[PDB]
């Protein structure tokens, strides 16, 4: 299957409550492997997966140093963003960064990412070409000018085509037991009456990895998109994920409804019904 590595930055200002907090988390697909928090007693990069513990002491030193320096850089960024939007030093603000690479089954680069946001709104984004930028507004346009002069896109390109894919290939090999294992969902349909003439059919998907999954209800082989209640995919706490789809159904007509399940752990898509 295909794979991805992502790092997520969150820099949060907190006037009156000390210097801005800087947090970094790293992921391979939907598995957390590394963590940094500037509010920790001894701030450093910490392992969150067994297959990253292997890495030598030099790896951990470099990674920590990057985070400690980024803590300083993103504090400067928050100050810079205040001038760009003419804001006071009294409010709390958040800069977020989302970057990494996707690789194909062969381990070759599919595409790279590097995008930022300010207060939950898109700020700047590196385009798929890994050489041009998209700025959301005139503030980020100033950042764009600064990055184009400093040949920043070219530095991303070299990383995304170089170190990003190289390390992700190593991580996938070392953690092959889990990262290259797809756990299929366990599925069943529940039945709860609402009225005397209305029943809720809920299609469960439990214990599946990765998170990507499709659950659809069909009435006589016809999709019920606008009539299906579909909750967000939630983590179970053991690496796996959970999801359910529900439909309000007239009693007697339960056998006209079929749940359809799509997940990479299944060789074929599953069709299930309420089994009385």
């Amino acid at each position: 299957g295909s794979h991805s590595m992502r790092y997520f930055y969150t820099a949060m200002s907190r006037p009156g409550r000390g210097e801005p907090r800087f947090i970094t988390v790293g992921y391979v697909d939907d598995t957390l492997f590394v963590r940094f928090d500037s509010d920790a007693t001894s701030p450093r990069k910490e392992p969150r997966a067994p297959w990253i513990e292997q890495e030598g002491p030099e790896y951990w030193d470099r990674e920590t140093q990057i985070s400690k320096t980024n803590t300083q850089t993103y504090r400067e960024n928050l100050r810079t963003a205040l001038r760009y939007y003419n804001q006071s030093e009294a409010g709390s603000h958040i800069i977020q960064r989302m970057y990494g690479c996707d690789v194909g089954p062969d381990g070759r680069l599919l595409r790279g990412y590097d995008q930022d946001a300010y207060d939950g709104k898109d700020y700047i984004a590196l385009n798929e070409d890994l050489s041009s930028w998209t700025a959301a507004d005139t503030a980020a346009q100033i950042t764009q000018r600064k990055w184009e002069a400093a040949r920043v896109a070219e530095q991303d390109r070299a990383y995304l085509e170089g170190l990003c894919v190289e390390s992700l290939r190593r991580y996938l090999e070392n953690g092959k037991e889990t990262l290259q294992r797809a756990d299929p969902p366990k599925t069943h349909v529940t039945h709860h009456p609402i009225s005397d003439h209305e029943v809720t059919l809920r299609c469960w998907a439990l214990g599946f990895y990765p998170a990507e999954i499709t659950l659809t209800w069909q009435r006589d082989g016809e999709d019920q998109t606008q009539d299906t209640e579909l909750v967000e995919t939630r983590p179970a706490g053991d690496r796996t994920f959970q999801k359910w789809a529900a439909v309000v159904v007239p009693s007697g007509e339960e056998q006209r409804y079929t749940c359809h399940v799509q997940h990479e752990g299944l060789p074929k898509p599953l069709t299930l019904r309420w089994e009385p």
Binding site: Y7, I66, T73, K146, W147, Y159, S167
Partner: peptide
């Protein structure tokens, strides 16, 4: 592995 060099806003 993280990208070493970062750029100011």
């Amino acid at each position: 592995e993280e990208f070493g060099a970062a750029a100011s806003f």
